[PDB]
Amino acid sequence: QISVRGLAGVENVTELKKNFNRHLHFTLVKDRNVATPRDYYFALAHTVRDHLVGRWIRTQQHYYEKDPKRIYYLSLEFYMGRTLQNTMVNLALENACDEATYQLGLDMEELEEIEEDAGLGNGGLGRLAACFLDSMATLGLAAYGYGIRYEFGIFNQKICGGWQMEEADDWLRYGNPWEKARPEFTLPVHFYGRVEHTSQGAKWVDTQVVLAMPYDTPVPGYRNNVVNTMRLWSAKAPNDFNLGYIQAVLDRNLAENISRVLYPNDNFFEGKELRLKQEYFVVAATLQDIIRRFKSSTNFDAFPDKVAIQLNDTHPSLAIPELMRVLVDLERLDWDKAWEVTVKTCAYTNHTVLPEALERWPVHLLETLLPRHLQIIYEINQRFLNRVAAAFPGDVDRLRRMSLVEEGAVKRINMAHLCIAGSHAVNGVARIHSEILKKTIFKDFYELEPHKFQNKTNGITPRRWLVLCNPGLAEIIAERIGEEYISDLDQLRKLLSYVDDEAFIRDVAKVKQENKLKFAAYLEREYKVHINPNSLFDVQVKRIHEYKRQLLNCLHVITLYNRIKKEPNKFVVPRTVMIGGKAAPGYHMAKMIIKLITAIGDVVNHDPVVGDRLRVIFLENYRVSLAEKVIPAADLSEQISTAGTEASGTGNMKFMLNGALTIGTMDGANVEMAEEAGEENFFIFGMRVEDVDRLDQRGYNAQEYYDRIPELRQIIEQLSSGFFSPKQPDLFKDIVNMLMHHDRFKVFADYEEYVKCQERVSALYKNPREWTRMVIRNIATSGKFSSDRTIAQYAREIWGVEPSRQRLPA
Amino acid sequence: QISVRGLAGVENVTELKKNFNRHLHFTLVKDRNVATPRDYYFALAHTVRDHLVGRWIRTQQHYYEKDPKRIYYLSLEFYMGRTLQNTMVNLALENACDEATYQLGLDMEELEEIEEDAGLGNGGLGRLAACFLDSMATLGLAAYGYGIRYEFGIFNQKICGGWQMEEADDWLRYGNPWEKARPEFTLPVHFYGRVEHTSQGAKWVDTQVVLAMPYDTPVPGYRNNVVNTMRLWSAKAPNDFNLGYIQAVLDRNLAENISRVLYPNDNFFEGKELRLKQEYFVVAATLQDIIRRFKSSTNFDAFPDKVAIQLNDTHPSLAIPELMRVLVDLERLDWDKAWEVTVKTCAYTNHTVLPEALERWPVHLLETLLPRHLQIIYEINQRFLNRVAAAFPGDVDRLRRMSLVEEGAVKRINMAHLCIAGSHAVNGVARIHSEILKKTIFKDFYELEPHKFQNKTNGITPRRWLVLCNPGLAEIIAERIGEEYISDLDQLRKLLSYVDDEAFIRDVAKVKQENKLKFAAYLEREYKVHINPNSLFDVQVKRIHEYKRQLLNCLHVITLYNRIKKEPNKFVVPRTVMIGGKAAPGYHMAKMIIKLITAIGDVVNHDPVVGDRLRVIFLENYRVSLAEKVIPAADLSEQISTAGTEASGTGNMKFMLNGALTIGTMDGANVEMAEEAGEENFFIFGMRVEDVDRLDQRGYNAQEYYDRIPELRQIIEQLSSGFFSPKQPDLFKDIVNMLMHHDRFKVFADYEEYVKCQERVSALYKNPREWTRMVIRNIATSGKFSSDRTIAQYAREIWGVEPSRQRLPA
Ligand SMILES: OC[C@H]1O[C@@H](c2csc(-c3ccccc3)n2)[C@H](O)[C@@H](O)[C@@H]1O
Numbered sequence A, B: 001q002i003s004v005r006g007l008a009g010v011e012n013v014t015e016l017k018k019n020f021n022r023h024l025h026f027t028l029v030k031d032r033n034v035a036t037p038r039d040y041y042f043a044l045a046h047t048v049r050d051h052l053v054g055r056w057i058r059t060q061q062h063y064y065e066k067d068p069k070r071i072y073y074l075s076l077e078f079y080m081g082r083t084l085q086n087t088m089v090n091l092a093l094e095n096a097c098d099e100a101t102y103q104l105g106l107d108m109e110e111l112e113e114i115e116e117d118a119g120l121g122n123g124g125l126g127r128l129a130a131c132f133l134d135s136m137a138t139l140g141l142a143a144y145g146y147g148i149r150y151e152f153g154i155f156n157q158k159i160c161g162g163w164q165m166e167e168a169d170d171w172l173r174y175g176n177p178w179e180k181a182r183p184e185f186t187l188p189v190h191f192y193g194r195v196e197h198t199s200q201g202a203k204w205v206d207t208q209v210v211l212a213m214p215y216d217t218p219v220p221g222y223r224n225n226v227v228n229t230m231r232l233w234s235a236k237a238p239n240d241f242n243l244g245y246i247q248a249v250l251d252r253n254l255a256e257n258i259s260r261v262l263y264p265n266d267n268f269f270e271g272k273e274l275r276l277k278q279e280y281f282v283v284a285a286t287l288q289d290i291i292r293r294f295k296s297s298t299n300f301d302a303f304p305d306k307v308a309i310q311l312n313d314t315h316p317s318l319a320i321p322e323l324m325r326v327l328v329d330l331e332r333l334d335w336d337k338a339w340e341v342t343v344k345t346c347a348y349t350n351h352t353v354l355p356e357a358l359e360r361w362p363v364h365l366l367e368t369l370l371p372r373h374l375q376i377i378y379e380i381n382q383r384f385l386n387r388v389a390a391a392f393p394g395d396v397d398r399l400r401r402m403s404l405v406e407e408g409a410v411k412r413i414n415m416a417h418l419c420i421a422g423s424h425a426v427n428g429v430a431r432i433h434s435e436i437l438k439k440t441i442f443k444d445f446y447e448l449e450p451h452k453f454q455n456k457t458n459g460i461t462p463r464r465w466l467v468l469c470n471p472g473l474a475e476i477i478a479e480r481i482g483e484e485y486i487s488d489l490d491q492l493r494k495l496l497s498y499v500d501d502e503a504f505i506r507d508v509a510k511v512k513q514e515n516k517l518k519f520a521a522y523l524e525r526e527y528k529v530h531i532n533p534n535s536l537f538d539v540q541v542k543r544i545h546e547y548k549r550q551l552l553n554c555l556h557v558i559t560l561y562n563r564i565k566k567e568p569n570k571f572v573v574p575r576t577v578m579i580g581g582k583a584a585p586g587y588h589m590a591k592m593i594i595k596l597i598t599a600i601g602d603v604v605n606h607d608p609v610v611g612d613r614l615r616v617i618f619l620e621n622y623r624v625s626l627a628e629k630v631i632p633a634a635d636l637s638e639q640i641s642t643a644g645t646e647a648s649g650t651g652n653m654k655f656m657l658n659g660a661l662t663i664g665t666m667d668g669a670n671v672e673m674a675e676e677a678g679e680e681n682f683f684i685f686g687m688r689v690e691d692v693d694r695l696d697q698r699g700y701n702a703q704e705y706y707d708r709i710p711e712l713r714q715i716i717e718q719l720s721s722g723f724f725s726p727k728q729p730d731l732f733k734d735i736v737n738m739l740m741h742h743d744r745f746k747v748f749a750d751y752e753e754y755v756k757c758q759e760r761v762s763a764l765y766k767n768p769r770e771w772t773r774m775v776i777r778n779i780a781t782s783g784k785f786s787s788d789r790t791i792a793q794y795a796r797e798i799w800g801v802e803p804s805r806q807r808l809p810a
């Protein structure tokens, strides 16, 4: 049908049909008379997986011959989403499979919709890991994603009476055709025990053994015939475990709990033992595998020439003491040689400055669970503080601040401190975030070792986030400038010579309108809801957080509503305001914000005076596959975090790529997005980092804003008095109370400038041609925000390897 | 190589090789350079499974068209063993696959050895279920095995210092290529709750839901292109289960525990709630499926014309009240019509008379877990006792004895009573066992309803138990009388015209000697043990039980040893005495007997005076796949249960078929084996049922035998004084104490006649020609003991269907 989906050759289509019927019969043991749409999805999945297999085997083979430096991306989260369309896109099979399925009387798009998201992540961080694996394969890096195969990923979100309910994400119920179990490479992981000191050094004994069983998932590069590996570990009890009889077998479930469930906290730390078990489990099994692969090339001087280990935040920080433990206790290297090897192997990406998100593990937990690691951590701390003392003699305060060990009621290990000490590179995830690291929380570490601190601004894969989710936009771009941009997104700048071309302006607006019609219909079908598709689609999709200020958005929506009620017969640009995201299940305030969003919707959507001029929709179960639908349908991207809180964001980039204008604060990658497009092509409002600091010094008094802004007082009096909760007048007293007395994120301080800036968005939306021209200027400058740029920067400036776009032979 | 293994056609072999290489590449994602023997086993498994798939689909299709009466075999146990060789045998692929694997440089026999037993059973009962499924498929019956997919089957037995240690049977670690998950036919099973009475009858409410997910395993018939289905249920939590968040997800394991582990008790009842949950789970999910399939043919008068349900002992007795509950509470049939349908649908096989094996469930357990079933059971009891009262007016004692409800400290339901009341047929499993049922424990039920009581003598499948385990014997038989006997074992009588043929006598002895050489070498390799293969192989393999009297065997072995020490320089027929079996983990006395067997071995095998004249071997981890090796190697079958305790036995039949002579009591199927071969071709000794009864009336005084038999006193003084346990002189005081004061199974009463009969075995073994002639007379009369005869009898006399040997088209 469309050019960027590849060729449907007569041979290819015939062969895809033969193999689809072979899998339906032999693999699924179904005839065509009893097959369900789900059997047809599986037969197709198996048929596309067959095209991966040769490439996967030849790629892993090639890495054995050439023995390049190996990259190990350690993450507790890989937010993969669906695999089928991504595989077809990257193998150029999409049109062939459309054709082959059409000739068997099936709709490929209907079968695509039956795939479960691999939801093994919370949001930005897990999804960055997935975009990275795609970019590492596209750039021919010998890269491995290592993590945990959670039985249950991020919970499925139901709304009941406007409240979030959680349901278990049973994503493996029907089987995962993408993974290959490798039970033959099962490795032991040790817990508890105690340290004995001998003549021959320290010895970790009386440990409980958990087995780590790997599942390999293929990661295809973009048409380069490279297939890298994501290895995920599953926890298994040994067969002698507890071995009255019955209970011993049932108690195997204590050990297997380690890989049962993803912790559903976004940008928050929960100090639970099961979480620390997950962190050690992935580090212990991964490092044995890394070392096994290295020894099949005694001499560990070459280890950092053959191995880069990237730590995705501090979640796998134990990789540092674990590598020391293996090198010192098992390989019998001296401390200093082992440490040199460790520092040159490890690098640490920091993702947040929020105090409540930084991992600070109580010493009593590490003492019980990982006694030897705690000894190695104390020893690291001693030798690290001795270097601080020598460089800053007499600065005892620096020594207390830089310590890996925090003093207090409970002693904690600062895992971030451990990562900086044990890594040759520390990077933030956007320029402003990397600057904030050097000026604030890591100032001391920066003054000791300025050379370690880098920026690597985040990116998104234009494969999933343009070609796959927005084929119509991909196509009209390819019509003008060819296909090369999909693996070289900087080529999108060539679109600037088309901002005054009438046909291109018409095609960009037509794709946007088609995406909106398609998404409005998706809402009708799956959730019986009626939206005007000629309205401005104002979309805020991201995890529910105080710092991301969904509440600021709520205040704008109630402001629009109050303005309609006051002057009902005046023209307003119509809007569908859509807010979606999950709250962490124990995050009371995030759960109240969801409830307020739905409560606003219950009042606004049923007011006859409002008409189809204002709709408020809570998008249920926001996840990777809902993002692929709603991002392409959006007109306005809401990126309205308080300046200095959103380290980068990646949602922002997705919408820039897909033809939405951004209303945002000078926070995270928003700053670099505005720099690339021009400030005049961006709806920037609100405090800078500098202004928030000025407010903090004098004191944030919310009362002042409530007293000076009559429009804001009206909203607060409405919230307080039960305008939005008639049967429960005090339902939202916690929200009012927090906004008035304990707002860390200064929602009221940005209110006036937000509402005024939202009027400028409406004004431009009245002028379709100038809206679409500004959209073109955004799409055209979105190249920097490709994960291909990000990974090429990690590769050249951290890992010491050269990316490549050269194809492996088929 | 050998004729009964089928043709290796040039096309067949080429095609098996192509598909083996296709599965190694596409299915296992291995090249030939990294593949292990286990990858080669899997590629072959997948290649043979592909030949099942067409036949399976066409068979299930054919049953939908023809809509024959359906047989449902409900068992908590299917002792399947390995599937690969069985599939090849029944599809005539064995020589083709040998040839195809040989040409790829692999040894098929080495790959066969890598398959895990499906050990979803304890022994005789579970293995009867497996032999039955094979015979039902061979006789073209529309039959379904229904059970539980236990994650852990019968434990792996290790011996440490002569003691049994249990290890978890992780049989699914590497995957099961034989099963097909059918998550789309998942059914709810209810537990707990309470009964509400309405206008519209009774209603079971506030229940906990467990999901039952079926796994289908193919059951190929012998070269008739029939493939029946074994459906096993797996327990799954619903996604709203417990739905702080983390614990709710981890607590899903409470529901999934139902199908986690097989209870490892043989011929013993443990009244545990988890066991009752397993019993309801398989019955609830199976009956919904049975009814679903019936409704795709309102009118339940025809139900028993379309459905037979066979209960394998009382383990699925809840099928009776469950069928009533569905018919009365859900389908709104009146009680009497529902009961008529239930009785005509259900039939009950009894397997034991041992009091401690009969299921008697406390009322308080049924009250809490299955409140509605208990109400239906009380109602059954009332209407049943009203018929007893009418037929036997004034016999209040009969009423107490026949009650489904036993009075006492705790009230119990007698599940056997429920089965007789709710079934149109009750059968024992050997003629003497069926007679004992009518004269003793079910006398009262027999006098009320004589027409219900049948015999169906057990059998074994000659496919697994001759062709598969003993190809050399199968072949020399096929040389003389053709192949037809494999599906018509009565044809073995034709071998009687060869008892005086010298070539046949030579070939029978050569196969036996080859089997013994092959088994002696298996012992050397896997367990570093050195046996004389010219010795008589005296084999007792079965679960470790007081009633099966391994101890009587021990007494003979110590007698032989004491006779050698007294007269070292006199000739004795050399023997390898091999005893093997598992003890139930909580069965203290069974665990002590294993320890005594190994303790005898430690003394006997290390005495230089004894030489290679007497060896005692404990065969570790006795299971279906060890039975396929040791049964063909045996000279003497030990079937020495106390008369009236072994309902049938099936081991006995396996050895008769495979060229071993039997030393046994007139117990179980031993009686009919002796009748078929002639008493003169059988080593019968000991008390009959009549003699045990005579001893019971006067009182069993073990002292009397100890006082009169000096040889026996010597053994007891040796056991007591620590002759067999030097460092622990009192190790075996429990064994001596039980034999002297509390022996329910009268070991000493059979001792004298056992030792004298064992001398007659030795005498005949000195005369190879007359031993082999007696062996021929045994093999020749073993036809009755085919499970094909058994199932044809169930079919004609219980289920009301005609067996068929006609092929489905390929
Ligand atoms: O770099 C990827 C994204 O990382 C987000 C983040 C920071 S900390 C964090 C986290 C996620 C799960 C469990 C614990 C912490 N996620 C962070 O909040 C986003 O700004 C950023 O875009």
Ligand SMILES: OC[C@H]1O[C@@H](c2csc(-c3ccccc3)n2)[C@H](O)[C@@H](O)[C@@H]1O
Pocket (backbone or CB within 6 Å): B122, B124, B125, B128, B265, B266, B267, B268, B269, B313, B351, B352, B357, B429, B458, B646, B647, B648, B649, B650, B668
């Ligand atoms: O009919 C098959 C075999 O059944 C054996 C049996 C009786 S009761 C029983 C059992 C097995 C497992 C759990 C509970 C009871 N097995 C019984 O002990 C054998 O004699 C007989 O051959």
Ligand SMILES: *Cc1c(COP(=O)(O)O)cnc(C)c1O
Pocket (backbone or CB within 6 Å): A122, A123, A124, A127, A541, A542, A543, A622, A623, A624, A625, A627, A648, A649, A650, A651, A652, A654
């Ligand atoms: C990209 C993405 C995110 C991250 O969005 P932010 O706006 O940067 O928080 C979260 N969830 C999903 C499903 C995503 O695709």
Ligand SMILES: *Cc1c(COP(=O)(O)O)cnc(C)c1O
Pocket (backbone or CB within 6 Å): B122, B123, B124, B127, B541, B542, B543, B622, B623, B624, B625, B627, B648, B649, B650, B651, B652, B654
């Ligand atoms: C046949 C068989 C049994 C039953 O043997 P009995 O001697 O009748 O108790 C038990 N276990 C296995 C593995 C069998 O094959």
